[PDB]
């Protein structure tokens, strides 16, 4: 059967032929409660006390109990289980290349990494998730060290020189849709380039970047206060008023694409994709494949980062204290296996339940390449050139750039829009809203005794009235 | 897109790695999340707590 | 008076998110429930449901 399946596209032997042969069969949960499963065929070929002589079925591979997102974790059986859960959560937030035809699509939110790499340390289950063809992350030289104190409490130090070379650079694509609509006979929204002495209630912005069809052109730089779609609605000397589509605030970028079409009911429909390049920043979220999330705390240049005797600086420095309470030992084994993989010129195997891969075997393989067998290296201080007294664990580890950039979250309000009903500030950074000084904050300021600050927050920084 | 080779999908500006399994409703891709339910036509006997029933069979 | 969230907008941030959202199961027990038994990883989930992939928080 194995020999016939080795030539699947020659013999026309398939999985369905293997089912028809009486070799495999589908067992559901009710039937599984009556079967006797051998975990491996080693449970079958067992001596006088096999613990069971009446095995009815055998697992094809136990690592198939994982899902799509848990199958990208290297050495998942060397990690604490909540960390595998956290990586299963964060692998859906990792930016790579989400689909091949992303240039055709205008999704509302899109995220494309410049240089996604397949992991040096993969699982075999990843061969069917197409993670080799659409990867989300970069193999990074990670040194686990305390350097200048800027990686503490789940933070990373990044190499600024690496970042300048395109390390974890991404593209954010945002699509804006608008359409003319005939909401009544007299009402007629239309894509026109508006004129100041003709349109009612403009938002004091520039309109020169619009073409005379009312739509901005691809390749044009745009900023937060810029018009990209010029739509005017006829008012039943200001015969029409401004209902133009504006770019979202503080989201600078470049118009990548403009598409004009007809909707279902036959009106003009425009979709504009704006492209913005996201260079890695302090406060951007990065995660390894083991639940080791963390924001970038600082970025040092190559001459400031610690270096090995070969001149290798880490791309990312993570804190040692991220490891002990977490017990993400699979992170350390992935780093060691990735050092071995990058030296040997091969892709390391990190299928969960594999006795062919062992920490001692990886250590001996690493010592065969002129490195210390436990992955430590003598690092030198970047600032002074002196050897660090401790020897630093350093090697390639697969990291992921998560969707949570700080520039999509930074928000301040001095004064601005307020709600109609309660005359309090608005909701969210998208509406220039205020932050909620909630009930618990009120209790905390009661316990502080700061009554005038409590009055400022709850009366005259929110909604004074007489 | 049924039965099309990867070259035909690329000529239609579709990703051959795209799995399908979703709908396009007003241009938005919608996936139907599978929903768990109790199995039908099966007798299940439980013990309701703090109630007038010591045991209850349900089908 | 109808169940919500059966149809969801398909996640397209990563190919892994697309696959995970296309293979997603849902217990329609209210997330305000504070009993642990439907949220527990049952023994009978071996090989059927991933033991690691679950959301964090109310779900």
């Amino acid at each position: 059967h194995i020999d016939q399946l080795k030539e699947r596209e020659y013999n026309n032997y398939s999985w369905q032929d293997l089912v028809a042969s009486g070799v495999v069969e589908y067992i559901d949960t009710l039937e599984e409660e009556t079967v006797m499963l051998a975990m491996t065929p080693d449970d079958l070929q067992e001596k006088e006390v096999a613990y069971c002589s009446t095995y009815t079925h055998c697992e094809i591979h136990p690592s198939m109990i994982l899902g799509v997102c848990a199958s990208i974790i290297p050495f998942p059986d060397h990690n604490q289980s909540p960390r595998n859960t956290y990586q299963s959560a964060m692998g859906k937030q990792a930016m790579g290349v989400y689909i091949t035809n992303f240039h055709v699509r205008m999704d509302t939110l899109a995220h494309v990494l410049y240089y996604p790499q397949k992991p040096l340390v993969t699982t075999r289950s990843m061969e069917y998730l197409r993670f080799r063809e659409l990867p989300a992350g970069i193999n990074s030289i990670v040194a686990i060290a305390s350097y200048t104190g800027y990686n503490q409490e789940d933070s990373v130090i990044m190499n600024r020189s690496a970042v300048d070379r395109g390390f974890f650079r991404s593209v954010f694509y945002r699509s804006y849709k608008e359409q003319e609509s005939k909401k009544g006979f007299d009402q007629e929204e239309v894509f026109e380039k508006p004129t100041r002495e003709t349109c009612q209630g403009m938002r004091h912005a520039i309109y020169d970047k619009l073409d005379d069809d009312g739509l901005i052109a691809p390749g044009v730089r745009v900023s937060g206060d810029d018009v990209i779609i010029g739509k005017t609605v006829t008012l039943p000397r200001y015969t029409k008023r401004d209902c133009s589509t504006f770019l979202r605030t503080s989201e600078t970028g470049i118009v990548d694409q403009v598409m004009v079409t007809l909707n279902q009911e036959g009106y003009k429909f425009c979709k504009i994709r704006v492209r913005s390049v996201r260079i890695p920043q302090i406060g951007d979220k990065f995660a390894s494949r083991h639940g080791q999330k963390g924001t970038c705390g600082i970025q040092y240049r190559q001459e400031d980062m610690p270096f090995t005797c070969e001149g290798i600086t880490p791309d990312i420095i993570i804190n040692p204290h991220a490891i002990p309470s977490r017990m993400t030992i699979g992170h350390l084994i992935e780093c060691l296996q990735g050092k071995v993989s990058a030296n040997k010129g091969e892709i390391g195997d990190a299928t969960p339940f594999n006795d062919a891969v062992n920490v001692q075997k990886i250590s001996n393989l690493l010592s065969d390449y002129g490195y210390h067998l436990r992955g430590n290296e003598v690092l030198y201080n970047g600032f002074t050139g002196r050897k660090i007294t401790s020897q630093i664990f350093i090697g390639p580890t697969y990291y992921q750039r998560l969707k949570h950039m700080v520039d999509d979250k930074i928000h301040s309000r001095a004064r601005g829009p307020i709600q109609i009903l309660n005359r309090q500030p608005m909701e969210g950074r998208s509406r220039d809203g205020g932050l909620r000084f909630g009930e618990m904050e009120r209790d905390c300021q009661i316990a502080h005794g700061a009554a005038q600050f409590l009055r400022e927050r709850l009366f005259e920084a929110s909604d004074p009235y007489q | 897109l049924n039965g099309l080779t990867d070259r035909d999908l690329c000529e239609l500006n579709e990703c051959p790695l795209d799995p399908g399994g979703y709908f396009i409703i007003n241009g938005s891709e919608k996936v139907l999340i599978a929903q768990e339910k109790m199995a039908t036509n099966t007798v299940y006997v439980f013990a309701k707590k703090d109630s007038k029933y010591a045991y209850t069979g349900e089908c | 008076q109808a169940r919500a969230g059966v149809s969801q907008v398909l996640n397209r941030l990563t190919f892994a998110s697309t696959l995970s959202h296309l293979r997603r199961l849902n217990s329609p027990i209210g997330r305000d429930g504070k009993l642990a038994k439907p949220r527990q990883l049952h023994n009978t989930l071996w090989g059927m449901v991933c033991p690691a992939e679950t959301p964090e928080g109310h779900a």
Binding site: L5, W15, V24, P41, Q45, I60, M64, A356 | G20 | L19
Partner: peptide, 29 residues
């Protein structure tokens, strides 16, 4: 002939590759 334990890993990932060549990942939908 029986699959030897030294060939078992390669054989089991062959049959897993055959399963995912036929069914894929969204076969249930």
């Amino acid at each position: 002939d029986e699959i030897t334990p030294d060939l078992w890993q390669e054989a089991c990932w062959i049959v897993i590759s055959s399963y995912f060549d036929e069914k894929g990942l969204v076969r249930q939908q």
